[PDB]
Amino acid sequence: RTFSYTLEDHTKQAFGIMNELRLSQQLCDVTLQVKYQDAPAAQFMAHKVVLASSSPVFKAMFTMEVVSIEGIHPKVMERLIEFAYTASISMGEKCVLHVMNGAVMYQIDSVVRACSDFLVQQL
Amino acid sequence: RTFSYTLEDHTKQAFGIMNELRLSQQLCDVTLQVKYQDAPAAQFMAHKVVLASSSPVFKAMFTMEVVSIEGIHPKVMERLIEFAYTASISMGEKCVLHVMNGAVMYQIDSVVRACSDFLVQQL
Numbered sequence: 097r098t099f100s101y102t103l104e105d106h107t108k109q110a111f112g113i114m115n116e117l118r119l120s121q122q123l124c125d126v127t128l129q130v131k132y133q134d135a136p137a138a139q140f141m142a143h144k145v146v147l148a149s150s151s152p153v154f155k156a157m158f159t160m161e162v163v164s165i166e167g168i169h170p171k172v173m174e175r176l177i178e179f180a181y182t183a184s185i186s187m188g189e190k191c192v193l194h195v196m197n198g199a200v201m202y203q204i205d206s207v208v209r210a211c212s213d214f215l216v217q218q219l
Numbered sequence: 220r221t222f223s224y225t226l227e228d229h230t231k232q233a234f235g236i237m238n239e240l241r242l243s244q245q246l247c248d249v250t251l252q253v254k255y256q257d258a259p260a261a262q263f264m265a266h267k268v269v270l271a272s273s274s275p276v277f278k279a280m281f282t283m284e285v286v287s288i289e290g291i292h293p294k295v296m297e298r299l300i301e302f303a304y305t306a307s308i309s310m311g312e313k314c315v316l317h318v319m320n321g322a323v324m325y326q327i328d329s330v331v332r333a334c335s336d337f338l339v340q341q342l
């Protein structure tokens with residue numbers, strides 16, 4: 097006989113700690129330098145493996161590093177990184193399209209679908 | 220108004236990819252060198268942030284690095300790393316105690332409790 101065990105919300109709890117570590121800027125191996133039209137420059141520290149596990153684009157990119165990012169608004173990038181680390185994303189009704197464009201850019205299909213589904217309803 | 224969205228099994232899916240990356244030995248930043256009485260030496264590559272998010276002991280340790288580990292059987296370490304990356308652990312009925320001792324050593328309380336609860340029933 098063999099004993100087997102599964103903790104249901106382990107992944108959720110471990111992501112909570114992973115998110116904590118990102119805010120404390122601990123164990124981070126990538127710094128995203130985001131520049132975009134008009135908007136001020138911004139830096140976001142993260143863990144390559146966490147981003148990679150949420151975005152095929154990020155996974156391709158990585159398989160301390162400073163990465164220059166263009167063509168995406170810093171606040172959009174912020175919301176997508178937050179999604180990677182928390183499984184949740186929120187945005188103002190009037191910017192749903194902008195977030196979708198970032199999501200499409202980094203192939204985060206669930207966010208893409210969600211924004212699309214919402215925008216279809218808005219007409 | 221603000222749009223908000225949550226993907227339920229995102230963390231589970233992202234851990235699946237994180238587990239994939241570990242097996243492919245990609246993005247890894249720690250190599251655990253495990254030596255124990257009689258048993259042959261073993262190496263385990265992992266991501267510091269993933270272990271850290273499952274074990275307070277690992278979190279303390281980290282906040283490519285080779286780490287020497289003693290006092291724990293390699294197959295026990297293997298099962299705990301697998302738990303960190305999959306939320307699931309299995310062991311032969313006759314070794315539940317050994318896994319518990321590793322779990323206690325690395326303060327993975329859910330595994331500890333599970334093994335304890337099972338061993339209490341076994342008497």
Ligand SMILES: *[C@H]1C(C#N)=C(O)[C@@H](C)[C@@H]2CCc3c(OC)nc(C)nc3[C@@]12C
Nearest residue numbers: 169171172175186187188189190191194
């Ligand atoms: C619109 C908005 C609202 N309300 C948000 O929730 C964030 C996510 C948006 C960031 C991107 C953006 C851009 O990018 C070009 N332009 C405008 C006019 N507004 C937004 C935000 C602030």
Ligand SMILES: *[C@H]1C(C#N)=C(O)[C@@H](C)[C@@H]2CCc3c(OC)nc(C)nc3[C@@]12C
Nearest residue numbers: 292294295298309310311312313314317
């Ligand atoms: C016992 C066992 C079974 N059946 C397992 O499932 C694994 C996890 C054990 C690893 C540790 C261990 C030790 O460690 C000192 N000693 C013995 C005799 N057996 C085990 C395993 C193989």
